[PDB]
């Protein structure tokens, strides 16, 4: 009785951070020891549960949230963080019990001239609640004058493209992130 | 260096048919692939970019799909101005590589080639060179095999072929094969023949002549 | 201090490029926008283009689509304006303007403005001015100084080291066909004081480090 | 109209140089990167080089790396390809093309294909001397609809133009593409199919025109 | 593009009067995307009114705004001395965000004739091989003034340049400086140098001359 970890980490295409995808995993034995021992994963950090002592633990359900950001933003996928991703795209609660795994995906998600497939929310009037998912494309009204669906001064599109390039700095290269939560 | 392979290499379709062309990449290239249409004597024309984004002006009967290593170009109802060679190009990294192309050919009835052989002219023999030409006129399909035999001796490496584009009137092809010998070698033999095997011919057709007569 | 500070004066040869900086302060740069406007000496305001700070998206005018590219750097809270292939027609003063915004909302107009950046484009070289006296003719008389042949702008002129201000007219400089500037500064004084009051104009030209104190004489 | 016109091609010996130009009009020149694509006779297109909007980035195929140099003059709306130390495998028709700029969320993304292509300019790298063709008759057979034609043999460079009876005879004419021989000269055949009855009561003259050598040869094709 | 035209070119008004400036668009524009700016010599533009009728922060309440569509108005109820400068209107709704050509609000005054002075080239400059003769028009109103150089009764043209100061903050007059430029060779070929000044305050053109040497 194994798990779909194979098709979640080694998936062909990931989702944008603003439209983060969630896979549900309930009752299947897994070996998180081959992942902690892997140099492929640039980030393996767990909260509320030790990353070493992980295989013994048992919880009723496991959620696998996956998305793509850039390297400088991987520090925001943690409880009590602030920034573009944490405030407007993906917020982890303070009492989050799980792990955050990330690896550099430059060879897959970067294109010469810039990739147009991965977006991130740039404007929002209020911060996201923990595990909230916002995919609305409403024109952000930054001023008092109401936008009527048309962009302009103080009327901007809420989503922006990363424009991933292979020549970008490693801080700006694409990173695929997988967030495991245990309830 | 990203390679691209297309299948099939040729397609014989008719007006209204649903034609699908595939493009396979040696590595995953996400949604960064384009499709081009090219007619003889003209620059390539962009039809689709980003897998499934129809270029402005291209009729909606053209469509595209795919992701990663496999991509598809579909023509719902083929129109007469769609018979051309189609190429797929990836844009993940430089160098931008193209596919080998797939030629969309007009389907028609099998027609056997009319075979004619021509001895070298007397004026050319005065130049010290002899050229024997074998003409395959108005046939279908394009596939054809020509063998030169000099006194029943099969030749190899001393002939060149040339095929016309598909005819705009009868959708047939024409082939011209030239055997080139020196005047010394040409006058050492008597019988010159080109044996033509073709799909419309139940058996190889041979046109010959005897040097002089 | 909701501020918007720009680069210093620029003097470039024709065919080169200039990049004017514009740094924000007081408000949160990340959510505002910055437009660029130029003004030639004595002309109207010419809108060049604007940029959204958060996204970097740009809109340019037709007349600047070819040689201007507007950028920004949210780390250094600064926006830039690159002007390629300079020519004499580009000699003007360039302003940056932005609405001040907090973390979520913006002002409904361009209320914050920069001090302005003067860009001079010509083949001329730095040169100090020659100051010649405008002597009074032999109840009120007029005298002054001729600040001739300098580059680039500007010069500053005072009379009696700042003591004489009443009746002083320092005219704006004209650009001669030689590429150098000429400026005249005159003062009207009573005719009686000509023999018992020394008048000295103080000409200072910072680009050439020239400090000339010339005394005007009634011949 | 959005238009790209290239020029500057021609015949050149191996190891020597050539400079291609590309004249653009109908679009803001400095908002688009530009590609050079070449296509050998009978083969598919091969991307050669690209240059960014401002000229700061340049990429080349390994085949031309170190020999070719791409450049652009945004003030003149002109693209250039400087070809040095030319080889035989450089012979192709050279197009200049405009980059496909994908816009998502008002952001531009470059290097996504080529949407506007030029007519192409031909370069030919060969050590062969310019030579007009010999025109030899392919006489119709005695009893073997009959076929006759002309053999346009040993000429350089491309192309020749072949008409029959000064263009009056067009029905049933097949002018084949030329083959490149091992000698470096081109050979070509142009044939026509006619009723056997007309062989003794209709002359057939093929007209071969070769501008590079300033030769026009007309050959009378008659039965033996 | 949307063309913005302003009127009047120069608004000559007395301090304490009500000023009215106009801004015209070539097509209907949003009222919430029009602004009014004030600019003083050597300074950056300063936002006065935005949204057609929304006073900016710190702008006095004597500044007002009205209009809709293609016609807009900037009204100053009581004109203060610190308000005499140049005013621009800009629409920032439809790109490009075009500006108007500007309106100069000057202090109206009574006609004052200029005090005219002529200056021969200094002996120090003559040593350099170039001669500069200067004609000063001091404190006059209105700004319009005409200077003609006459060298031995020969009217000069194409060898002179003018410069006008901003309106004085105390007497509301302007000053003009015109420079005639000749070489030392041509300067010594003539004897009488004079500049003729034509102005509204002069009942007839006034001529100020000097004799080369004396
Ligand atoms: C961020 O600012 C908005 C709007 O502020 C307006 O614009 C500023 C430039 C300044 O001129 C303010 O005086 C303006 O009010 C704030 O949103 C306003 O909040 C008040 C609170 O009661 C409300 O009455 C208004 O209707 C709101 N207006 C808008 C346009 O939202 C907002 O609260 C500020 N946020 C922070 C964190 O300070
Ligand atoms: C991913 O693929 C590698 C081989 O490339 C394999 O070793 C690894 O176990 C895989 N892991 C998952 C989670 O699919």
Author numbering:
A (entry chain R): 334 to 516
B (entry chain B): 1 to 213
C (entry chain H): 1 to 138, 144 to 224
D (entry chain A): 1 to 144, 149 to 228
E (entry chain L): 1 to 214
Would you copy out the relevant sentences from the publication that reported this structure?
S from both SARS-CoV-2 and SARS-CoV-1 uses angiotensin-converting enzyme 2 (ACE2) as the cell surface receptor (Hoffmann et al., 2020, Li, 2015), ACE2 is expressed in a number of tissues, including epithelial cells of the upper and lower respiratory tracts. S consists of two subunits, S1 that mediates receptor binding and S2 responsible for viral and host cell membrane fusion (Walls et al., 2020; Wrapp et al., 2020). The S1 fragment, at the membrane distal tip of S, includes an N-terminal domain (NTD) and receptor binding domain (RBD). Although both regions are immunogenic, the RBD contains the interacting surface for ACE2 binding (Lan et al., 2020).
A second V-region that repeatedly confers potent (IC50 < 0.1 μg/mL) neutralization is IGVH1-58 (mAbs: 55, 165, 253, and 318). Three antibodies (55, 165, and 253) harbor a disulfide bond in their CDR3s, compete strongly with each other for binding, and map to the neck epitope but do not compete with mAb 318. Unexpectedly, we found a 10-fold increase in neutralization titers when the heavy chain of mAb 253 (IGVH1-58, IGVK3-20) was combined with the light chain of either mAb 55 or 165, which have the same V-gene pairing (IGVH1-58, IGVK3-20) but a different J gene, having IGKJ1 in contrast of IGKJ2 in mAb 253. Remarkably the sole difference in contact residues is a Trp for Tyr substitution in mAbs 55 and 165. By switching light chains within these sets, we found that one (253) could improve functionally by an order of magnitude by using an alternate light chain to achieve better hydrophobic interactions with the key bridging region we identify, E484–F486. 75 binds on the right shoulder and overlaps the ACE2 binding site, however, the only HC-RBD contact is via the extended 20 residue H3, whereas the bulk of the interaction is with the LC, outside of the ACE2 footprint, and ACE2 binding could likely displace the extended H3 loop.
